[PDB]
Every structure is written in structure tokens, then in C-alpha cells.
Amino acid sequence: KVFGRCELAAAMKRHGLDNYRGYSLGNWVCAAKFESNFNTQATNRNTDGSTDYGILQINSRWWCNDGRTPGSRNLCNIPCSALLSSDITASVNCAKKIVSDGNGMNAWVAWRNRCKGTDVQAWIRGCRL
């Protein structure tokens, strides 16, 4: 599924991401825009052989099992394919674990380079939340 900006904001809000670990909603929307262009089916392969999955581009080196990333962990305890669902629950629940791991949203390189230090509230302006 390709979400609209406000539709995604609402879904993330219902799933408890608004101010989760002090990151306001616009941060999560901004990260999703630049990671996946709001497409839940996005995948991208990394040089190390790991793959990033879903709206928030969660990596198979640490967080999910795809059966093809040798020596990897599965800290969210989920198949990576679950991250591609139109239902964002699994992505959101895993993202809460990642953002809690010490580095905050800096775990998402697109957030650090494209969102951090910008007016992120612009990403939810106009939305009915």
C-alpha cells in the first residue's frame, strides 16, 4: 500500500508513535517519506548482503529474519516479509524497539540527513488528527 501523508500520520498516532521516546509525529512521517516514499512494499539491498524492508526500511542484519542474511540477528522476532504488510503494526512495534536501542532516530540514516534539524511539524500540517 502507498499511504497518503495524513493517512500515515493518523495510523502512526493510533499505534502510539506520537512522542514516543520524545520524537514528535512529524519525525516519523518525515523518515517514512524519505525511506520508502510511504510505500509499505519497498525493499532495498545493502552492500553487506542485508536487505531493508517496508515503510521504515528495517534491516535484516539485526531486526528481522529473511533467511538470506548469514550471521544476522532477528531482534524483533518476525519474518521480514511481515514488514511489507498494508497493516503497519509490525513495522511500528519493531521501530519502537530500534528507537529505544540507544541511538534514537539516528538509526535511520535518512532521518539524520533529511529530517533532523528541519521543521518536521510541516509533515503533519493540515492533517485532521
Active site residue 52: yes
Question: What span, in angstroms and rounded, lies between the C-alpha atoms of 50 and 59?
Answer: 7
What is the tally of helices (H) and strands (E) in the chain?
4, 3
The torsion angles phi and psi of 82, rounded to 5 degrees, stand at: -55, -25
Binding segment for Cl ion (CB under 5 A), chosen from 6-14, 61-69, 79-87, 94-102, is 61-69
Site residues (CB under 5 A) for Na ion, limited to 54-73: 54-56, 58, 60, 65, 69, 72
78 contacts which partner out of Cl ion, Na ion, none, CB within 5 to 8 A by kind?
Answer: none
Closest distance of CB 31 from Na ion, Å: 10
* Among the listed residues 86, 110, 127, the one whose alpha carbon sits nearest the alpha carbon of residue 28: 110
Q: Which of positions 7-46 make contact with Na ion (CB under 5 A)?
A: none
Min. distance of Cβ 88 from Na ion in angstroms?
A: 8
Residue 119 annotated to the active site? no
Give Cα 34 to chain centroid, integer Å.
10
Handedness of CA 80, 52, 97, 35 (dihedral sign): negative
Q: Which does 88 bind (CB under 5 to 8 A by kind): Cl ion, Na ion, none?
A: none
Q: Which residues are catalytic?
A: 35, 52
